[PDB]
């Protein structure tokens, strides 16, 4: 009845024509409107072999969000720095005639191997193309416990996506040092999750003891929490987030440094490019850390324990974080 296949999908959105936002104005063309009554079909007695790490849907999402950045986020070298509205909208990816999408419903399913509660969806849920490092922001959420995605965990070389089962917030601001900013998180709450994490990593790590530390070294973007708020790139120090000890007898809130930045490293092409002075109004993106991205030192083996430092940077992974339970297939 089917064989795996890749094919240029089509994209669907609630993008409102007129509103001058980037993601809207890019979706109102290239994307089609949204169905109000889409339908999920639970397939028969069915199990399918998924694999979130070799999924062509994430390479189409990937080239999508690129044709968005350099085109509606013009660089200050200057081609001219028009500044305009920027809040990602949810995009659905869909199948053209004669191909289907197989969704997975195993709640605690690492996006690889066999699934069993397979349904047929016409489109993927509303996914926002939210580019960041370290943390995965205002995304979806794991449905039961927490799930530890990775392509082969025994390889310290592989990025590790955790999908939180509980969502805790990040209030990220700058006032009206024209670049000082700061990100506000309720530590009470956020320490219980990472604790809850560690707990879930010990499952995957022979009850070995689990520690957290800043990234060992890299470009700022992946050494810090780089993200986009209304068109300004933030770079937050996170050291206060993977603080062990605080987890004992500790403290309440947390505040993060974060410095807005005009000069930055590209992730569309290869190179660099500056951006104008920001707006001296205020900026405040309240976001939901739905999942975090790390790398394992592992390097010892052994050493009695395992180390984990924040990561990200492969944005392909930001997508595989929400397109893991999908897979495309050809019919007749």
């Amino acid at each position, epitope marked *: 009845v089917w064989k795996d296949a890749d094919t240029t999908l089509f994209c669907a959105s609630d993008a409102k024509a007129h509103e001058t936002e980037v993601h809207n104005v890019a979706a*109102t*063309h290239a*994307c*089609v409107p949204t169905d*109000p009554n889409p339908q999920e079909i639970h397939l028969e007695n069915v199990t399918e072999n998924f694999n979130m790490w070799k999924n062509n849907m994430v390479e189409q999402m990937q080239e999508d969000v690129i044709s968005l950045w350099d085109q509606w986020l013009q660089p200050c070298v200057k081609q001219a720095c028009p500044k305009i509205s920027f809040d990602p909208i949810p995009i659905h990816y869909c*199948t*053209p005639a004669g191909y289907v999408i197989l969704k997975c419903n195993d709640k605690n399913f690492n996006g690889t191997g066999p699934c069993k509660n397979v349904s047929s969806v016409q489109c993927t849920h509303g996914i926002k193309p939210v580019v960041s490092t370290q943390l995965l922001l205002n995304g979806s959420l794991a449905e039961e416990e927490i799930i530890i995605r990775s392509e082969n965990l025994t390889n310290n070389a592989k990025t590790i996506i955790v999908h939180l089962n509980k969502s805790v917030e990040i209030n990220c601001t700058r006032p009206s040092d024209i670049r000082k900013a700061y990100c506000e998180i309720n530590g009470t709450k956020w320490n219980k999750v990472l604790k809850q994490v560690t707990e879930k990593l010990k499952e995957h790590f022979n009850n070995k003891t689990i520690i957290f530390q800043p990234p060992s070294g890299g470009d700022l973007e992946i050494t810090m929490h780089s993200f986009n708020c209304r068109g300004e790139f933030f770079y937050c120090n996170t050291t206060q987030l993977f603080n062990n000890t605080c987890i004992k007898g500790c403290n309440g809130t947390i505040t993060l440094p974060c410095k807005i930045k005009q000069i930055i490293n590209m992730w569309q092409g290869t190179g660099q490019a500056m951006y104008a002075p920001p707006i001296d109004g205020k900026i405040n993106c309240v976001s939901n850390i739905t999942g975090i991205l790390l790398t394992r030192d592992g390097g010892a083996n052994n050493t009695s324990n395992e180390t984990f430092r924040p990561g990200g940077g492969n944005i392909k992974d930001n997508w595989r974080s929400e397109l893991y339970k999908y897979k495309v297939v050809q019919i007749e």
Partner: antibody
Amino acid sequence: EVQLVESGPGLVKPSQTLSLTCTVSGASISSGGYFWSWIRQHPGKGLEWIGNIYYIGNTYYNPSLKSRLTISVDTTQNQFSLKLTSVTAADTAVYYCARVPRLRGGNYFDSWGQGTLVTVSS
Amino acid sequence: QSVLTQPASVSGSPGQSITISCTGTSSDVGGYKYVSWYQQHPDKAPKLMIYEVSNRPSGVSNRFSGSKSGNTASLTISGLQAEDEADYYCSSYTSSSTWVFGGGTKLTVLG
């Protein structure tokens, strides 16, 4: 696969209402991902574009005709029609049926119907 | 909706090569990667020749390329045969939220 055949009157009276229908076949019409367009070309003159309709409600028309133009989607959806009011001999054209469409881009009209001529005259 | 400006006619001898030009606004051809080309032939329907600026559907000859620079695109027949004599039409998506066509180009095979 994908055929497109136009049908409807070949003679409209001035002031009257012109009406045609595409019948998709090869189909479907609410599968993609696709748009369904109407286009005209007066004899010997050049191509003009009237409208597009997506399988849901949504229409996309030419602002030059927005005042006398409607498109819709009918029998089990499968087929879409044109309705052009207050005509004059200005609307004497070969009307065409055509599909676009917007996968992850590309807005271009393929699969064209050989076209039904329609003369406006009393 | 502008109206898109092509020549009224181009010309050239067999084996040769010529281009046809299509100019619109920064919001037409501008604008987007949604320029297409149509061949006519009397008295058939328009045939999709080039799409998304410079993409060619299967079953179209090898000698039709499409290009673009600024608000002007170009169709380039490369290896004129006496049977490409037809009308050509450039067309783009716009915004607006809609499509415009060029006025057409009767290309003629000299000799």
